Amino acid sequence: IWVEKYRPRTLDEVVGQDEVIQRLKGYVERKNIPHLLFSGPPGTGKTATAIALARDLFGENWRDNFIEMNASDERGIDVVRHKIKEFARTAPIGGAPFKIIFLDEADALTADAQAALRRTMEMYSKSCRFILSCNYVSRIIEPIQSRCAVFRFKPVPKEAMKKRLLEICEKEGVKITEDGLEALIYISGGDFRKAINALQGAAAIGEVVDADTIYQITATARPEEMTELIQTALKGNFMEARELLDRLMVEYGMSGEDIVAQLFREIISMPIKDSLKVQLIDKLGEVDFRLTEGANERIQLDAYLAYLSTLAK
Amino acid sequence: IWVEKYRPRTLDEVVGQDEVIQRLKGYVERKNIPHLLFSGPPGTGKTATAIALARDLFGENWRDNFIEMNASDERGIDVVRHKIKEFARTAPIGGAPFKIIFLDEADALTADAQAALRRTMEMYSKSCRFILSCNYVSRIIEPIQSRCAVFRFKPVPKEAMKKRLLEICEKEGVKITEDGLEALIYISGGDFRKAINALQGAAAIGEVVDADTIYQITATARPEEMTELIQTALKGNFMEARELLDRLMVEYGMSGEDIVAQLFREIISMPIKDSLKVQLIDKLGEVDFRLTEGANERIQLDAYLAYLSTLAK
Amino acid sequence: IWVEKYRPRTLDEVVGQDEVIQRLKGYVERKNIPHLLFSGPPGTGKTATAIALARDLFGENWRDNFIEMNASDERGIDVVRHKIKEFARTAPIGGAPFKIIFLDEADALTADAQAALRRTMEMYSKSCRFILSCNYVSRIIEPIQSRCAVFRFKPVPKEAMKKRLLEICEKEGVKITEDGLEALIYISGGDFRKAINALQGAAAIGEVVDADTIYQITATARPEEMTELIQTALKGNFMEARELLDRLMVEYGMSGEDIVAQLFREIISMPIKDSLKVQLIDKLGEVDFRLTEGANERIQLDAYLAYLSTLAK
Amino acid sequence: IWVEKYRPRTLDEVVGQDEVIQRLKGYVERKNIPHLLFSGPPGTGKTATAIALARDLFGENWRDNFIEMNASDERGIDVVRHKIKEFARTAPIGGAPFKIIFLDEADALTADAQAALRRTMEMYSKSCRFILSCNYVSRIIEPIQSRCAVFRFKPVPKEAMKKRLLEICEKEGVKITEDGLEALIYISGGDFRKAINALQGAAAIGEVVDADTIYQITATARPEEMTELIQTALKGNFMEARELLDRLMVEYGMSGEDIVAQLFREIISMPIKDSLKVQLIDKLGEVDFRLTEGANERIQLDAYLAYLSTLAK
Amino acid sequence: IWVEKYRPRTLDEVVGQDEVIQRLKGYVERKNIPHLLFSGPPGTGKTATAIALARDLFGENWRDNFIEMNASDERGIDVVRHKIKEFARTAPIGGAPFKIIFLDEADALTADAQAALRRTMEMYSKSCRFILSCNYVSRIIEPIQSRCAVFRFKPVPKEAMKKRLLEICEKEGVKITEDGLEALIYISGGDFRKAINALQGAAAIGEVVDADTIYQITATARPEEMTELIQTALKGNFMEARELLDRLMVEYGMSGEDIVAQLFREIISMPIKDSLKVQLIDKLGEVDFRLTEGANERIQLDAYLAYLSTLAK
Amino acid sequence: IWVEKYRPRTLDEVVGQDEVIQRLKGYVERKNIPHLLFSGPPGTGKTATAIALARDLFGENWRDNFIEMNASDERGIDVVRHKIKEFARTAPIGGAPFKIIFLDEADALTADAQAALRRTMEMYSKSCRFILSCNYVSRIIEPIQSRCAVFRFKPVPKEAMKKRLLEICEKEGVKITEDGLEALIYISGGDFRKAINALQGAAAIGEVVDADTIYQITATARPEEMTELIQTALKGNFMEARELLDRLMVEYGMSGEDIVAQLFREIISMPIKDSLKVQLIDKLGEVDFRLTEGANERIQLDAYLAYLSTLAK
Ligand SMILES: Nc1ncnc2c1ncn2[C@@H]1O[C@H](COP(=O)(O)OP(=O)(O)NP(=O)(O)O)[C@@H](O)[C@H]1O
Ligand SMILES: Nc1ncnc2c1ncn2[C@@H]1O[C@H](COP(=O)(O)OP(=O)(O)NP(=O)(O)O)[C@@H](O)[C@H]1O
Numbered sequence A, B, C, D, E, F: 001i002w003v004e005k006y007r008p009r010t011l012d013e014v015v016g017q018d019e020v021i022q023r024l025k026g027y028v029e030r031k032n033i034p035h036l037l038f039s040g041p042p043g044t045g046k047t048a049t050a051i052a053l054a055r056d057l058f059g060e061n062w063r064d065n066f067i068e069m070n071a072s073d074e075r076g077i078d079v080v081r082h083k084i085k086e087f088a089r090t091a092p093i094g095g096a097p098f099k100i101i102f103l104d105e106a107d108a109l110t111a112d113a114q115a116a117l118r119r120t121m122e123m124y125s126k127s128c129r130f131i132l133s134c135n136y137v138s139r140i141i142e143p144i145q146s147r148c149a150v151f152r153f154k155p156v157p158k159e160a161m162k163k164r165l166l167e168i169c170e171k172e173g174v175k176i177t178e179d180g181l182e183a184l185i186y187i188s189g190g191d192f193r194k195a196i197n198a199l200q201g202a203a204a205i206g207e208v209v210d211a212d213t214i215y216q217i218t219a220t221a222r223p224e225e226m227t228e229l230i231q232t233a234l235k236g237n238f239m240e241a242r243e244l245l246d247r248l249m250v251e252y253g254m255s256g257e258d259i260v261a262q263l264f265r266e267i268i269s270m271p272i273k274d275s276l277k278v279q280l281i282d283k284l285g286e287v288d289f290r291l292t293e294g295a296n297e298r299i300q301l302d303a304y305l306a307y308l309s310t311l312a313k
C-alpha cells in the first residue's frame, strides 16, 4: 500500500516543503499550535505533515487524539461535535498541553458551517486545535484565516521528489531507469500520491521500470507520439493523424480531457513560432470547451486534427 | 437472452482481453485479490470477467457472496452498507479466505462517496474486496487508484467478436449471412452487449439474418444511403440531398446527434482525399457543436448539406 | 497590538460613521439609551462605538459595568444571567442612571434565545441596556427590532479610513507612500482590523511602506505583475506571458477564479482605450464562464493569453 | 385576511376604475350582461368587480351561481363543463333571467380551448354568461373579443390606494406611519393584492408599521441602499459597490432579475441628467438580457458596476 | 353580434376577393366542387365564402348538410367520421348531387391525419367534398394540394372594406367620420373580424365615431403620439420619452409586442433617411427578440428609448 | 392527361431507376416473380414499373389480370378477396404461368391486415403474386419483407428526368428553354407527376416555355425577384427592399419560414464571395431561429433586410 507505508513519520521526513516545515518545526520546540491552515494542490503533503506534525508532538500517543475527517460531507460537522467534547475534556496523556483535529476539503463549505469552528477556538485554545486543509486559501472566508497561521504547499520540486522516489525503490528492490524516473514525474504533476501510486503499479509488474512502462501504466502518450501526431497533422496527412490518435487512444485509453491535456503540453513545448502556437492553443481552448459542454469526443478531436491540417499552406 | 446465456463462465472464456486475464489468472492460483479497478469502453467485459473472476475462485458458491450494484444511484452507497456487514462477517463457505463486491459506473460519483470505500478496505482486506468498473481511469480520484490493482479493457477486435458471435449462433440455430455479421458490427461499435442483444433481436424474428434485418432492428441508416447523400450533396444537388436526409431521418427517426454521428463515420470512410475530408470534418465539428448548444436541428443539418454543395467547384 | 491600542476612546474618535455617531451623540447629552441594534459588515466599528458609547457615558468607570460577550456560543445566554442580576442591582457609581451589555453575533441565534432578552428589557430599562451587533438587521426577529433603536454601519468609505490610517502613522513614525496607502485599502476591503493589522505588519519591517511592501505582507499578486503579464501578452510574446502567469500562479497559488478576478481588475484599471477594453472583458467574461462550467483551468487561461496575442495587429 | 375581508361588496365599492364601473353600472339597471372581457394589470380589480358585478345582480344569492376558476389549468376546461350544464338548466332563483362564470388568466390558452366557449355563448345567452380576465386584450384571439363587451382596467393611482389602505387600517386598529404607507406602495407596484397582503403581514406582527417593517416583510432593498450603491459605483469605488450589492443580495436574497429591477427603478428616479441616465439604462438593458439568456449573475452584475465606474471621468 | 349578423349570405356578398369569388362562381353554374383549399390571413373570408359557397348551392337547406369543424383539435378527426357516413349516405335533398364539410386550421396537423382525408375523396367525390382552410398553402403536404382546387385569400383591399364598413353603419345608424373609417383600417390590418368587431365596440358607446374613439377601443396609440415619442426620443429627451410611452401604455394598455409593433410602423413611415431608419429597425429587431425570449418589458422598452437618445449626436 | 399518356409501357421505358429495373429485367427472361416490395418517395415510379412489369410479361393481355388497389382503405382487403379467387383460378391466357396484384400505400396498415396476405402467398405462388408499394421499407412488418424481393426507388436524379422531360416535349412540339427545364425541376422535387403535370400546364398556353412561365404555373416566387430584393437590399435601399418583400409576400402569400427558405436558396446561389455569403447565412440562421421561437415575422424579416443594408460599406 505504498502511499501509506511511506507516510512520513516526522516533519523532517516530509519533503519539498522546506518553506512550510522549516517554520512548522519552530512550533514543536515551543509546543505552540495555533489553528493551522494548509493550502495547496492535492497530493503534496497537507495530510502528511498534518500527521507528522501531530506525530512529532505526541511521540507514540498521537493516534489516540488526532482524527482526520472530511469537511465536505455536510451533515456531520454537527455529528462529529461529540468527538469535540470528549477530546477537549481529555488532557494530553504524558506532559503536553494541547490537542489536534484535521479537516480535509475545508474549502467546500458555504459561509455558515465555517463559523461553528469559532466557538471551540476561543473555548479550546487552552486544549483543542484545528488544521484546515484547502485547495486554495482564497476560498476560506476571512473570519477563519483570521484565526489561522497559514501554510501554502507547493507542488513538490523535481529533485526532492526524484530523491524520495529512489529511496522508495532501493528499499523495495525495484529497478527504475533514469528514463522511468523523469517520466514518473512528467506524470506526477508534482503530486506524490500520483507518483508513488504509479511507481507501485509499475513495480507490481516485471522488473525493469522503463520510461514506457510508466507512460503505459498511467495511460499517457509517449511525448514522442503526441508531437508526432501533432506534426503529421500539421503536415497535411489528416487520415494518418486520425489513425494515430485512435491507436493512441486505445494503447493507453485516455479520456477526451486527457488527450486534450497532453495535446496542450506538447503544443506548448513544440519549438514552433509564438505566432502559430497561438492559433493552435486558441482552437484547443475551443475544443476543450466543446467537450466539457458534452459534445462528441471522437468528432471534436478529429475535428481538431482537421483544424491543424488546414494550416498546411 | 443470449447476452447472458453466453456470459463467460471462466476467466479462460472471456476473450480479446489476454492483456488483463493473463495476469488476472495469476490471482486465482495464489487466491489473492486486491481491490480491482476495471476500466474501459462499455461492453468489453468488465462485468463479465468480474463475474468469471468471482466464478473461478468460488466454484459453485459465487452467487451467494458476489453482488453487483450500480454505483451511480447516489442514495444507496449507504443503503447497501448493511450488505457490507453480513457479507464481511460470513466466512467464504468451503475453504477460501476472501469475498467480492462489484460496482458498475464508479466514475459517476463526486469525491465524497468515493472515500466511504476506504473504511472497509483496511477493515476488510482480510475478508472483503471491491471491483470498480469505470469508463476511464482518469475519472476516479487518486485515493482509490491508490488501493487498486488496475486493468484497462480494450475494445475487442473485429474477428474475435465475429467468431464469438457465430458460436452464439451455430449453438442457437440462427442463420446469419456474411452481410449480417459485418453489419452486426458496424452496429456493435465494438461493444458486445449491443452486438449480442441486437443479434438476439434478429434471431427472435423469422429465420435468415440479413445485412438489413440488422440495420432495421437497431434503427440505423444503411451506410449506402449516407454515402449516397453525402455524394449527391457534393455533386451540387442540394435540394436532392435535403430530400434524402429528410426521408432518411424519418425512415429510422434518428436524433441530430445520431445523424451527425453516421455523417462522420461515412465521411471518414469515404475514399476521398485527405485534403477535402478535412474541410468536411472541420465543418461537421462545427455543426455538431451548434446542435449541442441547442440550435436548430433541421437548419444546421441542411445548412451543412449546403456547405458540401458549395465545394462543387 | 494596534487594532486595540487604537480602539477609539470616544464617539468623536469613531470615523466614517457620522450617520450613526452624529445621532448616537444625541444620546449622551440626554443620557438616554434604548437598546441599541448595531448592524453592518464586520470590522466597521460596532464593537468600537459600542465601547466609546459606553466610554462617553461613564467617564473612567466603564470597564467595571460594560461586558461584551459573544451571543452565538449557545449554552451561555443562560449562564451569563447571574451577571445580569449583580449588574442590574448595582447603581452606576457616580451620578448616572443606567448600564450596558454588548452582544456580538446576535444574528446567529434561532427565535427562542432572542426572547429571553425581553424579561430584562421592561424589567431593566430603569437600570440595564443591551447593544446588539449583527451582520444584517433582517436576521433579527421582529419582536426585538421592536424594542431597539437601530443603527446601520456602512463599510468605512475610502478617505475616512485613509485619513485615520495616516493619523495611526504620523503618530507612529512610519512612512507610507501614496501607493502604500491606496494599496493598504485594496487590501482592507473597507475593514479596519484587516487594514490596521496589515499596516502594523509593514511598519514592523524596515522603513518606507511601499505599494509592494503591502501586497507582500498580506500575500497577493503584485498589481505590477498582472499588468505586466497582460501587457507582454498584448505585445505578442505568448510563451513569455504563459510563463509569467504560471510562475505567478504558484508564487501565490491562486484559483482560476482568483486569477480571472485580478485579470479583470487590472484589465479595467489599464489606461487603454474604452474600445479595446471591451474586447478584453467580453472575452474574460467568456473564460470565466468556461471555468465555472468546469472546463480546464490551465487551458482556458493560457487560451485567453492566446486571445490577447492575436490583437497584436 | 384583509385582501378578502375588504373585497368590494358592490360596484360602487370598487375604486379608481370609474372608467369601467360607470358603464358597468348601466348593465345592472337593465339587467343585461354580454360576455365580459376584463383586461388589465394584475391586482386592479377584475376579480373584484367581477364579484361585485355578480353581487349587485343577485343580492344575497350570488355564491350559489357564480364560480371563479383559473383558465390556465389546461385539462379542466372540459372537466368543468358539467358545471356548465347544471348551472345552465337552473333558473336564477328569485326574479332574474341570467347567470355568470368567471375565468381568470384566460390569456394563457392557445387558440383551441378558446373556441369551446362559443357553443355555450349562443346556446346560453338566454341563461349563461362568461367574464374573461386577461393581462392584455391583444392576447385573446379575435373570435372571442367578437362576442365580448370589453373593459380595460387601469392601475389604480397612488392616493386612491393610499386612502383605501388607511380605511383597511383604521378599521383594523393598525398603526401605519406615513413612511409605511408610501413604502407599502413602492412595494405594491399599483397592485392591491400585493399591497393589502403585505400590510396584513405587517399587521400580524407587533404594532407600529414602519417604512422598514414593510421593506422587510416583502424582502426588498431599502431604496436608500440602491441609490447609495449606484452612487458609490459612479464615483469610482468599484470594490466598495461590489461589496454593497453582495451584502445587499444576501440581506434580502434577491434574484438577478430582482436586483436588475430595482437597479432600474432607482436609476430612473435618480436626479441625474437625461443624458447619462440613458447610458446607464441602455447598458442595464444589456445586462438584463445577458442574465435571461442564462449568463452568469455574479459576473454580469459586478460587470455592470464595473460599467458605472468607468464613467467616473 | 355583428361579425355574424353580417356573414355574407351569397358569394356576390363576400368582398375584396374577386380573385377567388369570380372563379368560385363558375362552380355554382356547373354545380361542380372539387375539394377546396382556402388559404390566406385570418379574418379575410375563408369561413365566410365557404358558407356563402355552401349557401349558393343549397338555397335554403345548407345548415342541414354543411358542418364546420376545427381540424387542430387532434383526437376528433376520427371522432367526426360517423358524421362522414350519415352525411355521405344522405342525398342532397331537392335536386343537387353533392355535399360539403369545412375544416378550419388544417395547417396545424402533422402528415398522418392529413392522409385520412383521402379515403373519402375517391370514395366520396360522387357525394362528399371538403373545404380546407389554412393560413398558408405551403404548410399542407402535397398529397392534398394534389386533390384540391386552391384559393389564396388576400387581406381585404382598402375601398372594398371601407365600403362594406359603411353599409354596416348606415344600416345601424352609427356615425363614423372619415377619420374613424381610415383609422378603423389602420387597425383592421385588412382583417374584417378585427374591423367589424372594433366598429361594433365604438358603436356600443355614445354616438359620433371619431379617429380616436377607434384608436382607444383597440388600444393602439394615435399615430401622432408614437411619432412624437420616437421624435422626442431622438431629440435626446430620454426622461420625457419614457414618460410618454408610460402614459401611452396606460391610456390604451398595450402589450410589449403591441408597442413594439406600432413602434415599427411609425419608424417605417417616418420620413427620415434610409440610412438611420436601418439603425432604428435593426435595434427594434433586437428589442422585439429580447421580449419574446421573456426578458423585461419595461426595461427593454425604455432601454430602446435609451438607444434612440444616444444617436442625438 | 400527360401523367398517364406517358406511363411507361415497358421496363426499358421507366427511367432513373436502373438500380431496380436492371435487376427487375432478370425476372422477365426467367418469368419468375416473387412478391415484389417497391419502396421509395412518391412519384418515382413504383406504380409505373409495377405496370410496365406486368406489361412486359403479358404482352397485350395485362389489363385483364393485373389490378391496382389502395391498401389503406381499411375495410376492403377482405372485400377484394373474391377478386383473389376468380383471378387465382384463371390460368394466364396464352403461355405464362403466373399473375399479379398491386397494392399502393401498404405502409399504412397495422400488423393484422398484413398477415392476410400470407395465406395466398404459399397458396398462390404457383399462380398469384403481390406487388407492395410503400413509402419506407422499415414500416412493413418483418413477416412480409420475409417473403418479398425488395426494391428501393430513389428520387429520380436530375439528368434522367431532364432527358425524359425533353422526349415528352420534342414529341409534343413544345419549346422549353434551358431555364424552363432547370426551373421545371426546382419545382419537381424529383417527382414526375408534379413535373410532367406542370410542363403540361405551361404547354397548354402560348408557346415558348420560360423559367418564369414555369414558376408562375405552379405559383412560386420568381427566383429573379428574390435575388432582386436581396440585391437592392445589399445596395442600401432598405425602404425599397422592404417594399418588395411586402408585395412579394402577398403576391404569393408565403409564410415566414417560406420566405426565409427562398431567401436561403437565393443567398446560396448568389454569385457573391464565399466570404460575405457566410455573413448572410449566419444571420439568416439567426432570423430563422427568432421566428421559430415565435418572435415577429414582419419585424425580424425587415430586420434582416436591415442587416443587409448595413454591409453597404
Ligand atoms: N510532501 C510529501 N513528502 C513526502 N511524502 C509525501 C508528500 N506528499 C505525499 N506523500 C506520500 O503520499 C501520500 C499522499 O499524502 P498527502 O498529500 O498528505 O495526502 P493528500 O491529503 O491526499 N494530499 P495533500 O492534501 O497535499 O496532503 C502520503 O500518505 C505520503 O506518504
Ligand atoms: N470481452 C468479452 N468477452 C467475452 N464475452 C463478452 C465480452 N464482452 C461482452 N461479452 C458478453 O456480452 C455480455 C456483455 O459483456 P460485459 O462487457 O462483460 O458486460 P456489460 O454489462 O455488457 N458491460 P461492461 O461494463 O463492459 O462489463 C456479457 O454478459 C458477455 O457474456
Ligand SMILES: Nc1ncnc2c1ncn2[C@@H]1O[C@H](COP(=O)(O)OP(=O)(O)NP(=O)(O)O)[C@@H](O)[C@H]1O
Pocket: D003, D004, D006, D007, D008, D013, D014, D015, D016, D017, D041, D042, D043, D044, D045, D046, D047, D048, D049, D133, D156, D192, D193, D196
Ligand atoms: N381596484 C380595486 N378597488 C377596490 N378594491 C380592490 C381593487 N383591487 C384590489 N382590491 C382589493 O384587493 C383584492 C385584490 O383585488 P382584485 O384585482 O379585484 O382581485 P385579484 O385576485 O387580487 N387580481 P385581478 O386579476 O386584477 O382581479 C380584492 O379582493 C379587493 O378587495
Ligand SMILES: Nc1ncnc2c1ncn2[C@@H]1O[C@H](COP(=O)(O)OP(=O)(O)NP(=O)(O)O)[C@@H](O)[C@H]1O
Pocket: D143, E002, E003, E004, E006, E007, E008, E013, E014, E015, E016, E017, E040, E041, E042, E043, E044, E045, E046, E047, E048, E049, E133, E153, E156, E164, E192, E193, E196
Ligand atoms: N371577405 C369578407 N367579406 C365580407 N365580410 C367578411 C369577410 N371576411 C369576414 N367578414 C365578416 O367577418 C366575419 C369573419 O369571417 P371569416 O374571415 O370567414 O371568419 P374567419 O374564419 O375567423 N377568418 P377567415 O379564416 O379568413 O374566414 C364573418 O362572419 C363575416 O361576416
Ligand SMILES: Nc1ncnc2c1ncn2[C@@H]1O[C@H](COP(=O)(O)OP(=O)(O)NP(=O)(O)O)[C@@H](O)[C@H]1O
Pocket: F002, F003, F004, F006, F007, F008, F013, F014, F015, F016, F017, F040, F041, F042, F043, F044, F045, F046, F047, F048, F049, F104, F133, F156, F164, F192, F193, F196
Ligand atoms: N421512373 C419513372 N419513369 C418514367 N415515368 C415515370 C417515372 N415515375 C413516374 N413517371 C410518370 O409519372 C407518373 C407518376 O408515376 P407513378 O409512380 O406511376 O405514379 P405514382 O404512383 O403517383 N408514384 P408512386 O406511387 O411512387 O409509384 C406516371 O404515371 C409516369 O408516367
